[PDB]
């Protein structure tokens, strides 16, 4: 498990790292723990939290892409084809760094 996105995410300041990694864990966990709830599979690119606290942060959007999200015009979508396994892998990597 050697993620370029997670390594980049860890290069942020402690404060920003915490803020962004927290959001990333929530996006992952909501899908992992509610796999039949479609509402957790799409994130609006213009959502205030997402656009201001996640997207501007080096490494963070790439963590979503490595999890399996795809970028549409207005949303990032976790598609039907995407494995929980790859999603879980990135969640686990980020959580280690938050405990670290």
């Amino acid at each position: 498990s050697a993620s370029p996105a997670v390594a980049e995410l860890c290069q942020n300041t402690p404060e920003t790292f915490l803020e962004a990694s927290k959001l990333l864990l929530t996006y992952a966990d909501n899908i992992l723990r509610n796999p039949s709830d479609e509402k957790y599979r799409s994130i609006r690119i213009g959502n205030t939290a997402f656009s201001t606290r996640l997207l501007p942060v080096r490494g963070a959007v790439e963590c979503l892409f490595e999890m399996g999200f795809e970028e549409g015009e207005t949303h990032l979508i976790f598609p039907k084809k995407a494995s929980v396994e790859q999603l879980q892998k990135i969640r686990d990597l980020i959580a280690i760094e938050r405990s670290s």
Partner: peptide, 5 residues
């Protein structure tokens, strides 16, 4: 704080 919509 809504993260989705």
């Amino acid at each position: 704080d809504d993260l989705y919509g």
